[PDB]
Design a protein around this nucleic acid. Structure first.
Ligand SMILES: Nc1nc2c(ncn2[C@@H]2O[C@H](COP(=O)(O)OP(=O)(O)O)[C@@H](O)[C@H]2O)c(=O)[nH]1
Ligand SMILES: [Mg+2]
Ligand SMILES: [Mg+2]
Ligand SMILES: [Mg+2]
Ligand SMILES: [Mg+2]
Ligand SMILES: [Mg+2]
Ligand SMILES: [Mg+2]
Ligand SMILES: [Mg+2]
Length: 140
RNA sequence: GGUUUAGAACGUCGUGAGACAGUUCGGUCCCUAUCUGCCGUGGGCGCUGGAGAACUGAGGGGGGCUGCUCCUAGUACGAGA
């Protein structure tokens, strides 16, 4: 019946300031789980999540897009977990979208830049996550 | 080709011949370079005995233009775009 046990389900979001690497980190996720044959770059519009023509041309995420993966482990340590990742936007022009995805998800991976670190949109996603008390981790 | 020759016509001016910063069609553009100048190329002599070659280098000339794509780099800057 149920393909994967309830414990092996992750509904996660990738939230942070504009251009912290969120859309790339999602491409490298879809790559290390084999679902996409090409790595693709955000600047060259190759990114699958950036499907809208505006997203391809301007290299920005103007919407939330959802994808799935099967991450066994680094050494196949665990049984394949079905991670539902909905890539989100960081532009203040689209905050409803990040809160929209943020509410349902059980965890958030907050991207950051090593040069800048805490940025305005990073505080914005922080306050939004804190009000909904989502458990968080961070990726620099 | 235009402008300004001789032909002809329009409009206008004049009685007229003709005329118009008015127009219209047609209408002969010569020279074998003496000298300077310049581009080449040699003959004479000189450089102190004659000759063959290899050069130094004062000086002179030639050349000096730039686009686009990628890497750095979505890097610095920018809340962003
Ligand atoms: N140097 C470098 N550039 C990165 C890295 N991750 C992403 N980028 C680039 O930085 C830009 C912004 O990243 P992106 O994933 O589009 O951010 P998002 O729009 O917030 O999801 C894009 O041109 C990416 O290719 C990284 O680790 N290093
Ligand atoms: Mg993005
Ligand atoms: Mg005659
Ligand atoms: Mg010269
Ligand atoms: Mg010279
Ligand atoms: Mg580029
Ligand atoms: Mg950019
Ligand atoms: Mg723009």
């Amino acid at each position: 019946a149920r393909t994967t046990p309830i414990a092996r389900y992750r509904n996660i979001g990738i939230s942070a300031h504009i251009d912290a690497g969120k859309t790339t980190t999602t491409e490298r996720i879809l790559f290390y789980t084999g679902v996409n044959h090409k790595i693709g770059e955000v600047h060259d519009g190759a990114a699958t999540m950036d499907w809208m023509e505006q997203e391809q041309e301007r290299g920005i995420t103007i919407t939330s897009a959802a994808t799935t993966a099967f991450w066994s482990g680094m050494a196949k340590q665990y049984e394949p977990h079905r991670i539902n990742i909905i890539d989100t936007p960081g532009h203040v022009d689209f905050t409803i979208e990040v809160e929209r995805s943020m509410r349902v998800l059980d965890g958030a991976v907050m991207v950051y830049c090593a040069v800048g670190g805490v940025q305005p949109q990073s505080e914005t996603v922080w306050r939004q996550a804190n009000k909904y008390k989502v458990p968080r981790i961070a990726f620099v």
